[PDB]
Design a protein around this nucleic acid. Structure first.
Ligand SMILES: [Zn+2]
Lengths: 159, 66, 50, 347, 31, 58, 48, 49, 126
RNA sequence: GAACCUGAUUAAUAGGGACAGUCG
RNA sequence: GUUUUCAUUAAUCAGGAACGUAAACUAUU
């Protein structure tokens, strides 16, 4: 692919290898994937969040199964926020980064609200039908999006 | 195709008009649908998806139902 | 989580502020139940105990 | 109804553009200030209403918030950033003696009752609290993930170190200054223009809101409103409790001032004028007898509450006749003839 | 008549139409 | 037009309200002390700074 | 260049369509002659 | 002066909360001669009685 | 149909400022409209606006402005012409602003005299 | 004469067409 | 209405083309 491993790339790749056997009885995108890419940069203070980059048809190949895959990737690996994303190299690319960030939940609207001077704040709203299990992940979403792109956005459920 | 359905509606209107020959509302709708056909056909000519010498007056209607 | 830790700390702050307004409930109750109120208050006078 | 003559006067020549902020001095009795829309502020003395006492071309944009310190000095917000002046000095100084730009676009001010502390509501979703003479940037208290602007801010004057705020999330938020964090946040249905507290009951607050409505809330139980005053036509721009804590003024976005009792739920009086263009800021004097109205015509007007009650020293058989009439209307005010004549007002 | 209406061209709604002579008339006045 | 069309807000019964008014306020029918005590206003505002209350009274 | 309070009163009594002329009149650099009479009628004020 | 209009109070509370006589009823309402469906219900009641 | 979506937006702003409303729903959005409202917000005639997406713009207005307008042929203007154009478009030189599509962007005439650049007259407010 | 922009876009709160139950 | 497609095809009318005894009181709101 692109990589020769770091300290944790081989660990996450060994997790993807170990999910084949000695477990379920579920594997569809597990065998056609290799070492891909990963990053470990902090979210908040004290906690970190692991992101893994994915080839661009394997994003829908991963949209096939992401329930309980990310649960076991959270539990069995390091007890931190696991997060998959496509790898890419403008505004359509950042839109793609947002809509592949929020994986169960479809974003609805973007409100780019200016202030009484030249400053402006973007705020993307989410879907109301899934609210309970995402709100503790929202600051991780915002911080990973800032760390990858540079644009401060804040995530909020509509009320 | 939009043009295909429009010329199909045109042949249907002209066949009913040939059978009946007395009414004028079908003739007016025929004038509307032939103007619509010519406008969409001109846009598809200036794109170039179909031959620029292809024309529909009545013989193309006859040779596309035949 | 940071949201839940913040929510518990701000619930504790809400209980403390409700205690420091429950110290005022009794005088608000007497002012609303009294028959004649005299303004300005005697405690706000610039010569209070002279 | 015959001697109901509420308009008393107008402070000076007024402003050029409309009066978008004004603030009294809560320690003195005749010190008013008003900042207009072309960014000029004026300090008025209520004893000599013929001309202003001190004016300065303060900012560039409109003056959004304005307040008096507890010593003698006054503060003013803008989108420029907040500034501090000494309007009472033996030479007049136009230049400020402190300025603050960091902390986003500020919207409103509120000064502490006793100390030299004040809180400025900014547009970054935070309020920030300065103590004068030993703090430079202040401490920024915010709801943890908050983006929408905090429109108004108000120190509770009875219970010190409790700060209320409204925000364009149609929400009210509280703040405890003793443990520097927010406390509780409730989302209402429509946006609230202004929060204010009761100066005799420490826990009651009033929000003037774009629902044409005044909501009297209890700060301990935000479940339901203690009272809902509904009388307006356009949105309510400003609300202010009387210093006796039993009445309310609201200046609305149409051309009306509405005077309310605290338990009423409907208008005691309505004040209006063809010259008054809109109403933005209404506040009592510390007499609790006269109210002041900063309009969009550039005018600060001085009305009176209790429109038919004249001031000054009364003889005993004069004030006994007035008190006898008021008690008699309290008894027989609900009969049909008396009711229609006491409710008729020309709108 | 309204006071606020400007003096160069006609105003329709929020659209102000200036004829080609009027923008030439201002350029003549400048020179 | 001199009868009352409905009960006033705090009152719950016709006997309560029509028996609660019952006594003229005026100085012709009551003594001077009673007239003063019955037409004293509820809120008595004197002149001055009406500052918000510093400390709890009760 | 002076403007009586009757003149300012009639400019204010005209509606918010005349807000620009009101601000132009309310320019600060001009003298404001306060009037001591009742009706605020600018013609009789100016003539008196 | 100040006593209750009892009819008006009963109407206000209504708009807030919202075999020996039924023969002379028909004797009084056979004379109109409007048929008036309450009288149809009264005729069915008299037939049952 | 008015292809001038800026003129449709400014017509809606003028209707709200006449009717005394406190916000609008500018239904077709753009970028020149956003720059126009950015200048109006710099000079304080409009409170706060947000672009939401299906998009449209919600414009909180203070109740301070009188009139918005677009100059429909968009005539080119130099600085020595800009002074006469300002004093012929505005009721007073100290009230209201003329909007310019310059090589430095979209700005008011005072910022154009600051940055020493001329351009086309696109609109005005006062 | 739309917006978007230091190998094929927004899918338009402008179009034309298709299908279904219909309506006069 | 749809869980429908090409993506400027469009707006306006110079020229032209199809249908054909009476009158008499009057961006929103
Ligand atoms: Zn005069």
């Amino acid at each position: 692919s692109r990589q020769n491993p770091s300290d944790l790339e081989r660990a996450i790749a060994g997790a993807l290898y170990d999910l084949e056997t000695n477990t379920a009885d579920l594997k569809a995108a597990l065998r056609p994937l290799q070492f891909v890419s990963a990053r470990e940069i902090e979210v908040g203070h004290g906690k970190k969040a692991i992101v893994i980059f994915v080839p661009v048809p394997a994003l829908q190949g991963f949209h096939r199964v992401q329930q309980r895959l990310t649960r076991e990737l959270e539990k069995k690996f390091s007890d931190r926020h696991v997060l998959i994303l496509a790898a890419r190299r403008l505004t359509a690319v950042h839109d793609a980064i947002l809509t592949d960030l929020v994986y169960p939940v479809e974003i609805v609207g973007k409100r780019l609200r200016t202030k009484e001077d030249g400053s402006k704040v973007l705020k993307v709203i989410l879907d109301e039908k899934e609210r309970g299990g995402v709100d503790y992940r929202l600051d991780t979403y915002s911080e990973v999006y800032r760390r990858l792109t540079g644009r401060n956005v804040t995530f909020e459920f509509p009320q | 195709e939009d043009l295909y359905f429009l010329i199909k509606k045109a042949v249907a209107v002209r066949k009913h008009l040939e059978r009946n020959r007395k009414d004028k509302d079908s003739k007016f709708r025929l004038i509307l649908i032939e103007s619509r056909i010519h406008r969409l056909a001109r846009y598809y000519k200036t794109v170039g998806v179909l031959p620029p010498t292809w024309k529909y007056e009545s013989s193309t209607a006859s040779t596309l139902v035949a | 989580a940071k949201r839940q830790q913040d929510r518990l700390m701000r619930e504790a702050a809400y209980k403390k502020t409700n205690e420091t307004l429950d110290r005022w409930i009794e005088t608000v109750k007497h002012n609303r139940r009294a028959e004649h109120l005299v303004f300005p208050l005697a405690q706000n006078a610039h010569d209070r105990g002279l | 109804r015959m001697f109901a003559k509420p308009f008393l006067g107008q402070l000076g020549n007024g402003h050029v553009q409309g009066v978008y902020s004004m603030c009294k001095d809560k320690n003195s009795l005749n010190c008013i200030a008003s900042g207009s829309g072309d960014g000029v502020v004026k300090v008025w003395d209520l004893t000599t209403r013929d001309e202003e006492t001190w004016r300065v071309a303060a900012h560039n944009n409109i003056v959004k918030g304005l307040t008096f310190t507890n010593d003698k000095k006054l503060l003013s917000c803008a989108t420029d950033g907040i500034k501090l002046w000494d309007p009472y000095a033996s030479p007049s100084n136009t230049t400020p003696i402190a300025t603050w730009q960091e902390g986003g676009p500020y919207t409103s001010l509120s000064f502490h009752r006793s100390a030299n502390t004040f809180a400025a509501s900014s547009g970054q979703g935070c309020i920030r609290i300065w103590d004068l003479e030993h703090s430079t940037a202040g401490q920024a208290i915010q709801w943890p993930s908050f983006v929408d602007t905090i429109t108004d801010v108000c120190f509770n004057q009875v219970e010190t170190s409790v700060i209320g705020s409204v925000a364009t999330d149609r929400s009210i938020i509280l703040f405890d200054l003793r443990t520097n964090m927010p406390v509780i946040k409730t989302v209402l249905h429509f946006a609230c223009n202004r929060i204010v507290f009761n100066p005799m009951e420490a826990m009651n607050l009033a929000v003037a809101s774009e629902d044409h409505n005044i909501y009297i809330f209890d700060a301990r139980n935000f479940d339901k409103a203690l009272n809902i005053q509904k009388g307006h036509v356009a949105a309510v721009m400003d609300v202010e409790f009387s210093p006796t804590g039993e009445e309310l003024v609201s200046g609305s976005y149409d051309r009306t001032i509405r005077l309310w009792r605290r338990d009423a739920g409907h208008s005691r009086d309505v004040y209006h004028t063809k010259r008054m263009q809109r109403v933005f800021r209404t506040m009592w004097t510390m007499d609790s007898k006269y109210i002041l109205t900063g309009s969009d015509d550039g005018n600060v007007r001085l009305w009176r509450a209790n429109a038919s009650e004249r001031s000054g020293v009364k003889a005993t058989r004069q004030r006994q006749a007035l008190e006898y009439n008021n008690a008699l209307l309290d008894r027989y005010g609900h009969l049909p003839e008396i009711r229609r004549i006491r409710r008729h007002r020309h709108l | 008549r309204p006071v606020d209406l400007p003096a160069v061209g006609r105003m329709r709604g929020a659209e102000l139409r200036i004829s080609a002579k009027e923008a030439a008339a201002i350029a003549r006045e400048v020179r | 037009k001199y009868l009352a069309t409905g009960l006033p807000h705090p009152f719950e019964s016709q006997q309560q309200y029509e028996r609660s008014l019952r006594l003229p306020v005026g100085p012709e029918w009551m003594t001077k002390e009673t007239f003063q005590d019955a037409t004293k206003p509820r809120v008595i505002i004197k002149q001055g700074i009406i500052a918000p209350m510093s400390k709890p009274m009760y | 260049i002076i403007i009586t309070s009757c003149v300012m009163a009639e400019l204010e009594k005209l509606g918010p369509r005349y807000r620009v002329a009101l601000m132009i009149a309310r320019d600060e650099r001009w003298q404001r002659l306060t009037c001591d009479h009742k009706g605020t009628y600018a013609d009789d004020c100016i003539v008196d | 002066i100040g006593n209750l209009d009892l009819r008006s109070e009963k109407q206000r509370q209504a708009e807030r909360d919202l075999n020996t006589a039924l023969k002379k009823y028909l004797r009084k309402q056979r004379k109109k001669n409007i048929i008036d469906e309450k009288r149809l219900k009264a005729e069915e009641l008299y037939r049952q009685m | 149909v008015r292809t001038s979506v800026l003129h449709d937006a400014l017509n809606s702003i003028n209707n709200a400022e006449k009717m005394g409303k406190r916000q609008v729903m500018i239904r077709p959005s753009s970028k020149v409209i956003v720059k126009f409202l950015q200048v109006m917000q710099r000079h304080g005639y409009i409170g706060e606006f947000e672009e939401v997406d299906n998009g449209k713009i919600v414009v909180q207005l203070n109740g301070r402005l009188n009139k918005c307008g677009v100059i429909s042929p968009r005539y080119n203007v130099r600085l020595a012409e800009l002074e006469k154009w300002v004093t012929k478009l505005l009721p007073a030189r100290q009230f209201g602003y003329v909007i310019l599509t310059t090589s430095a962007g979209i700005m008011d005439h005072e910022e154009a005299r600051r940055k020493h650049v001329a351009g086309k007259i696109i609109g005005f407010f006062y």
